[PDB]
Amino acid sequence: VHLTPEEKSAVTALWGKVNVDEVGGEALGRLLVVYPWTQRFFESFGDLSTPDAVMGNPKVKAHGKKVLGAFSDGLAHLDNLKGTFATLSELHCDKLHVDPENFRLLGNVLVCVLAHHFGKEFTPPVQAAYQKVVAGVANALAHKYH
Amino acid sequence: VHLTPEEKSAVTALWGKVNVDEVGGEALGRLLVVYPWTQRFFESFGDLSTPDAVMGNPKVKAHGKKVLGAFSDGLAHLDNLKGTFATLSELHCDKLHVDPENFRLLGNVLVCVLAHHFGKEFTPPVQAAYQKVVAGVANALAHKYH
Amino acid sequence: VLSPADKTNVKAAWGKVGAHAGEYGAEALERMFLSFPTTKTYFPHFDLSHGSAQVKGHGKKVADALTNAVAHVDDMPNALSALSDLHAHKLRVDPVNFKLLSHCLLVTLAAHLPAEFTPAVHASLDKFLASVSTVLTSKYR
Amino acid sequence: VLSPADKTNVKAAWGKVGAHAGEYGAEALERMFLSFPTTKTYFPHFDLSHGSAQVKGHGKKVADALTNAVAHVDDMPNALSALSDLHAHKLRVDPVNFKLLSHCLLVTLAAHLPAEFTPAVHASLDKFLASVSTVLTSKYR
Numbered sequence A, B: 001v002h003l004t005p006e007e008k009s010a011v012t013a014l015w016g017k018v019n020v021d022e023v024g025g026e027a028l029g030r031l032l033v034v035y036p037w038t039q040r041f042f043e044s045f046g047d048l049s050t051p052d053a054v055m056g057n058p059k060v061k062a063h064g065k066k067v068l069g070a071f072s073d074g075l076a077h078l079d080n081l082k083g084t085f086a087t088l089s090e091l092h093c094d095k096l097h098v099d100p101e102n103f104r105l106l107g108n109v110l111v112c113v114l115a116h117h118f119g120k121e122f123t124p125p126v127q128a129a130y131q132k133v134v135a136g137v138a139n140a141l142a143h144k145y146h
Numbered sequence C, D: 001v002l003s004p005a006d007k008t009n010v011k012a013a014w015g016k017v018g019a020h021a022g023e024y025g026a027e028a029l030e031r032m033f034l035s036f037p038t039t040k041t042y043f044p045h046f047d048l049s050h051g052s053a054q055v056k057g058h059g060k061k062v063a064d065a066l067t068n069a070v071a072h073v074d075d076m077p078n079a080l081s082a083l084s085d086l087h088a089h090k091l092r093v094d095p096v097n098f099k100l101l102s103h104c105l106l107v108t109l110a111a112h113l114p115a116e117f118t119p120a121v122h123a124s125l126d127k128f129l130a131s132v133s134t135v136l137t138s139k140y141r
């Protein structure tokens, strides 16, 4: 994945500082608030009717963690994302029927959550690398759709 | 790009019946006609205000064929679109400053023109293959942007 | 922005589709599922095998809605308000999918109306399909 | 459609942006050029080096246009008229490019407004921006 080692290095160093528990929750959370058509996929999650119902929804908070776990596990394999995510793409396609276009929203929402937590430390170049990472994760999650 | 041999095959057969002079002009011309902003880059071509002017402009028809010739070259290196279009990419990016989003449009008008030419002979299945090529091409002309 | 000449072309083009609109909506549905398999995510409850009763039947509903649009082009947003509430609040389809359906429609039209599919017609239909799309994607948020 | 809460969310967010808006706009441009070089094609004349004064200044004009639109949230299409011709007629800027800049305004604002960048405001700011981009892209043909 066209990620210079310098890019690759920034990504990693930032990610070590990440509270995966919390970030996953926020990201999945904002995704459901900002692009509320993405709530249809999670009706088993209980109340989603207000910003707070969501951000605070435990099932949301739990699922967010699962998601970020899958994410970290891609940062440990930048060089074979398609494979790392092959089972997970397939699932989202065949069982969940999610439009791959939503993986990009999540990705950009992820990036805004990183920017929110880290501040000036989330510099344009670090963002830039992060955009390469989320796009690859996303491409890799759409890869097995058929 | 990952193209089934039946697809690699569906594509070529049809390609071989393509009238390069006729289809090159119609694509290039419909692009300018249907997505007018594109004209900006070709304004050294002459009169391009009205359809008839665009479709009858010999500088269009000629470039049209040049464009299709490069397409023809990619149909023969399908497994290596990047290396072929590497110089064409630099050019389009360093000299001409064309936003790669315009490549999709050309790719698609191109599919539109073929469908227009071959009629029923341009079946849904044939189309899917060309859709894949045309995308490969676009991605390939966009790879060396920086 | 549908210009009177667009309108004029959209009327002139469709009216040739005429009693084939239904057959053509289906082909376009077929082409889309085959070229852009991710649009299939919206039709899991359908059989999407080559020529299936659902696709055929759903093809007629799309084509028919388009006809409603041509006839009511001068006032599309009010004419579609229903459809629009269906594709945005309850179904909620990503705008991007419309671009793909519209493109395949043109391939279909392009493929069956050889004399009618001129550069200007091409052009107008594209602004037309784009306009329908926008109307259908307006009330999401 | 921007709503009252939206409207209010945006006035309070941009209000905090206050004087640092030109700065935030140039940071936005930097994030864009760096994270999405295709956009660079529209500025073959700028000097785009980190810290460039051609950027910093352009940055400000964007910020201002945004403040203006903020200030006419209820009549955005007519307030931004001038800029919609520019972008859609003299410049002709593909609309994806706006999604991209939009995204970088949010990241930029998120990085400078911890207390303010709540889920509901994030949703409001995104709507606003989609709104502006929609005006600025409205006259494309």
Ligand code: HEM
Residues within 6 Å of the ligand: B038, B039, B041, B042, B044, B063, B066, B067, B070, B071, B088, B092, B096, B098, B102, B103, B106, B107, B137, B138, B141
């Ligand atoms: C992927 C499809 C396209 C291909 C394969 C392609 C290929 C080419 C080729 C082969 C050349 C000529 C190189 C030479 O003469 O040595 C060229 C030149 C050029 N291309 Fe593209 N092109 C594509 C799409 C576009 C797009 C859509 C535009 C802008 C709308 C564009 C803008 C230009 C311009 C302005 C020139 C210079 C022509 C001249 O004035 O001499 N290309 N392109």
Ligand code: HEM
Residues within 6 Å of the ligand: C039, C042, C043, C058, C061, C062, C065, C066, C083, C086, C087, C091, C093, C097, C098, C099, C101, C102, C132, C133, C136
């Ligand atoms: C040209 C734009 C489109 C038009 C005019 C259109 C029209 C329609 C119509 C007339 C219906 C049937 C609703 C009724 O009972 O009246 C429908 C349903 C539906 N549309 Fe669209 N449609 C368009 C694009 C799309 C696209 C792009 C998608 C997603 C790729 C989509 C997905 C669906 C789905 C999943 C249904 C439900 C059908 C069923 O469950 O039986 N539509 N649309």
